[PDB]
Design a protein around this ligand. Structure first.
Ligand SMILES: Nc1ncnc2c1ncn2[C@@H]1O[C@H](COP(=O)(O)OP(=O)(O)NP(=O)(O)O)[C@@H](O)[C@H]1O
Ligand SMILES: Nc1ncnc2c1ncn2[C@@H]1O[C@H](COP(=O)(O)OP(=O)(O)NP(=O)(O)O)[C@@H](O)[C@H]1O
Ligand SMILES: O=C(C[C@H]1NCCC[C@@H]1O)Cn1cnc2cc(Br)c(Cl)cc2c1=O
Ligand SMILES: O=C(C[C@H]1NCCC[C@@H]1O)Cn1cnc2cc(Br)c(Cl)cc2c1=O
Ligand SMILES: [Mg+2]
Ligand SMILES: [Mg+2]
Lengths: 563, 563
């Protein structure tokens, strides 16, 4: 393609609101444009990268017999009522009415739709297993869209769904997908790690998330150096082995603590280490108010609380709800309320806690005497340095972007939506399901996060929108224009060449080229009359003069040796 | 792919409601499944056909420098307010609210979105022309979804938009698109004709529709045998040259006409030919009621009326609106109402018309004496046999499916949405726009309409979901299964082979194969031990025995000679 005919609105200045490097670079390089919060257009270069990603995805899906389909975005509410998700979900599910008042969801994911396709069609065990996938734009009215394509409201997902006669068959396809996902991410230029993910509040099914390792990552991976242990910090269990720090029991005492809000401020005020303070938070669990206690150097993990209580309906009590129930909160109160404490609170006595009265705290508070703990448990995040759940060694942290997930779904949808098959013994059984997804537009951004420098994007060979950037320094000069025209015709059969044929200053062409980030650059300039050009590598910045008779061999060898 | 792993829910019986052959066959062959009215899932084989169509589309777009992008479905109402389409359109535009009460349209087409992309980015004449396109699902809440993929509510469109400094540049790209569209349709196996289309009520810009010639087609193409004249029957002008059939003027007379509703019933009742009766219809044009007169053998053309009056707000008066104004209607009434008559009414005198009184009609009604005609004009459809507007010869009719359109849009959106560029002389000018579209999912159905027989689909080589159907008659037999396994491995590198490896009766495999419609079939049966198979052509039904040492050459030669 001649660059004069390709829309590439490169920017001089990136706005302050853009925080993530991938977001900043996709804007600056003229690859995406925001329509509104969380909603983007993919401009020509991004679209080519998306096409390269989806071609790799299609190869890897076909390799494991995952068969492509395309399902609708517009989905009748009645389908979502069958599963119960219509009623279970709130504003994140986008909803609308047609001209006859009939209600619809815009698909955030397709468990019901795909179940509706296969039910009473996958009728026998002889037809199983079956795996279907699509590459299709999903809709989620995210509370906080952010970081460009990393969290949109309209976004591209590759979602797959598999159907099975038994658990062993599901296990096989889950492994196939796991392996296919590893291949997909490596091929597109992402360094990713599969990590054990949380199975949800109620379920205990096997699930792994694929995490693109990057500093912008909002997930923390807990990993071992001694074993293959890798878990989301939300899931990673903390094993408690007693190590008491108890002193002589003292009488309870309310103390004045003016302008003291936080646990660390209280620690500083009393001249004590923060770990000896116990923090108290009020949660609302299935309508009932509870208290959760953790030490001052720890933080409450809501995902563990949800899994512990076995419900997703857990949230912090609001300002008004706290006042109606009881400044800094504490466990000593004359009221029927269940108090839960993290296991590591047992290492202390003479607790420092809130007084349920602004400007005050309690010291020398003791369990049994002053208040009772109903149950102890693992209600916190692991810290870096602590011993892992498998006993292999010490916990280390790495930050990650969730680029995909694999999930053993089971019979949830097939039971609720009556999707059955006749087994070996002729009896009706619900289809056993797996579901799997890659965030395609998120993955595009993750590629940029891991493949860029201070001057722009550095696209991997596998996904670069064009292979070669052919640039004329001054096309007013006949020798330069004509040589570049000839080289375009020569190289645009074997390679995809972006030919910067524009009547633009050399400096802007090179700045644009740095942003755009194609792996190899052929510069036609002052030595065109001699049949000499310059070849420049985007990754290293290495430049060399090359004569046109050698150029095909030099470019091909350089291209083949790219990662 | 092994057919045991591909979801293909072939049907024994097609429901009565499915009318169009393409709709019936896409259902019967297991290629689509309805989710609800006008909303479909594309099953594995249809998805492969769609991928083949879009690959051809992409090649032909790149050939004319039409550059791929991907724009969002979710579009803020504020954008649609800029153009005025938010207010101009009614229930066909699907609308919704997000969680903050902000209003959105689901894109039925993307003129505003694309204008928002390029405005203040295509800043100079030096950047023009620019052509962008996407392949993306559109949403239209159609009043009457029908014929499967021919009229959906969620459907795939390839929409392109071009931007220009002057009218000559627009003319060039319009011609490029016209030519590209001709190529696309021929390549995918559609016999199509470009025809002059109506430019709308207000505008007079150049537009052509591409019509897939087929009997299910709801459009009628008027064409010449002597010239290149081709027009939609909505547009095709009728030139009136007087041929009076006048008799001696008679006195007006009201006559009893019991149980006479229609013009032909009245003709039969009075013993007169139907052409001597004048029909009267009441229309509402920009709030004002009018009368339109046409002869009994003619019909009113609303598209001509809209173009004549220069407004889209024309509709028939309702039952209640007719009563408030005045059985069979007629022009003789004591009221201030404008009466328009088709030109061919002038060939008659002593008109037979309604009496504005149930059970009665008027005879011997004459213009000037009994009523006045305000204006005469071309308000009807041309009939087959009549002389064409260009004077080349006689009108012939062919039925067609509108598979695409090309349109010289001009500055409508660039004016309303302030999308300007600096011209040669440094002054701001609105971007001159073209817009173009192909219905991709409609085109898939049109391919089936033109490429099928009584036993199933007959896919063209260019778009067939697989190239070869490899079928084992009885895979319990080791020689058959093993030979078929070997041939699959041999042929699935050069070709895409669907291998019917299923443990199913031969009869169902062949019935499924006929429906599925791949061009060549390799049958492994009783002579597998001898290294002999049967090759069968789907189009002709010709079968021949072939030895496996000759099979690659025989298949390749047959495949190369397919249309
Ligand atoms: N709002 C979004 N924008 C872009 N990509 C997304 C978004 N939500 C999910 N994805 C991607 O789609 C994949 C599958 O969806 P899903 O498993 O439902 O995500 P999720 O659990 O909601 N992730 P998150 O919201 O980031 O915690 C994810 O692994 C992401 O890569
Ligand atoms: N409801 C639909 N279902 C499937 N395809 C459609 C639909 N509407 C339009 N298309 C296709 O998209 C192309 C461009 O859209 P457009 O020019 O807006 O169609 P249109 O004038 O509304 N046609 P029609 O509604 O059939 O009279 C058409 O030429 C069709 O091939
Ligand atoms: O979407 C999932 C589970 C899996 N679905 C198939 C693709 C891969 C993915 O991990 C989790 N999820 C995430 N977000 C959601 C948001 C809404 Br709104 C709804 Cl209704 C449902 C969901 C929802 O089910
Ligand atoms: O969509 C068009 C004009 C052209 N747009 C770009 C692709 C090719 C197509 O011919 C005509 N059209 C047809 N149907 C529509 C339905 C609705 Br609802 C709206 Cl808002 C707008 C429209 C509308 O503009
Ligand atoms: Mg989410
Ligand atoms: Mg329409």
């Amino acid at each position: 393609m001649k660059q004069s005919k390709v829309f590439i609105p490169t920017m001089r200045d990136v706005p302050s609101e853009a925080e993530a490097q991938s977001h900043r670079l996709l804007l600056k390089s003229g690859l995406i444009k925001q329509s509104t919060s969380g909603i983007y257009s993919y401009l020509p270069l991004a679209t080519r990268v998306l096409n390269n990603i989806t071609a790799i995805v299609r190869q890897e899906m076909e390799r494991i017999d995952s068969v492509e389909i395309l399902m609708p975005a517009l989905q009748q509410a009645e389908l979502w009522e069958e599963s119960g998700r219509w009623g279970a979900y709130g504003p994140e599910l986008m909803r609308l009415q047609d001209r006859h008042g009939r209600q619809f969801a815009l698909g955030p994911t397709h468990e019901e739709l795909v179940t509706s396709i296969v039910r009473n069609e996958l009728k026998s065990y002889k037809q199983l297993p079956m795996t279907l996938f699509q590459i299709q734009s999903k809709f989620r009215d995210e509370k906080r869209p952010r970081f460009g394509l990393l969290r949109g409201r309209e976004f591209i997902m590759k979602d797959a769904y598999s159907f099975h006669a038994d658990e062993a068959s599901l296990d096989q396809t889950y492994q196939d997908m796991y392996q296919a996902y590893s291949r997909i991410f490596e091929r597109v230029g992402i360094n990713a790690r599969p990590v054990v993910a949380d199975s949800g509040a109620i379920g205990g099914s096997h699930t792994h998330e694929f995490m693109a390792l990057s500093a912008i990552g909002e997930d923390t991976i807990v990993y071992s150096k001694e074993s293959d242990y890798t878990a989301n910090i939300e899931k990673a269990e903390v094993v408690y082995e007693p190590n008491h720090k108890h002193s002589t029991v003292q009488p309870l005492e309310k103390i004045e603590t003016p302008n003291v809000k936080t646990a660390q401020e209280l620690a500083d005020f009393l001249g004590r280490p923060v770990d000896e303070i116990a923090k108290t938070m009020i949660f609302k669990v299935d309508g009932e108010y509870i208290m959760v206690l953790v030490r001052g150097h720890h933080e409450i993990n809501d995902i563990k609380l949800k899994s512990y209580f076995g419900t997703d309906n857990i949230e912090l009590a609001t300002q008004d709800e706290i006042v109606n129930l009881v400044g800094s909160l504490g466990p000593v109160i004359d009221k029927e309320i269940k108090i839960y404490a993290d296991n590591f609170v047992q290492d202390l006595n003479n607790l420092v806690v809130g007084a349920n009265e602004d400007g005050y705290h309690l010291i020398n508070v003791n369990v049994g005497r002053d208040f009772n703990v109903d149950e102890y448990g693992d209600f916190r995040f692991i810290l870096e340095g602590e011993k892992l759940s498998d006993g292999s060694g010490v916990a280390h942290f790495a930050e990650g972007i969730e680029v995909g997930q694999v999930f053993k779904l089971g019979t949830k949808y097939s039971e609720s939506m009556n999707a059955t098959f006749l087994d070996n013994q002729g009896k009706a059984q619900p289809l056993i399901m797996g579901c799997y997804g890659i965030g395609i537009s998120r993955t595009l951004s993750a590629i940029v996060e891991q493949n860029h420098d201070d001057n722009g994007i550095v696209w991997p060979k596998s996904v670069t929108p064009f292979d070669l950037h052919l640039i004329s320094i001054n096309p007013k000069k006949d020798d330069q224009r004509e040589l570049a025209d000839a080289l375009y015709a020569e190289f645009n059969t074997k390679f995809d060449v972006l030919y910067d044929d524009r009547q633009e200053r050399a400096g802007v062409k090179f700045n644009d080229a740095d942003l755009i980030g194609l792996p190899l650059r052929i510069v036609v300039g002052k030595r065109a009359s001699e049949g000499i050009v310059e070849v420049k590598e985007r990754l290293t910045g290495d430049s060399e003069e090359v004569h046109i008779d050698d150029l095909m061999t030099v470019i091909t060898n350089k291209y083949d040796n790219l990662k």
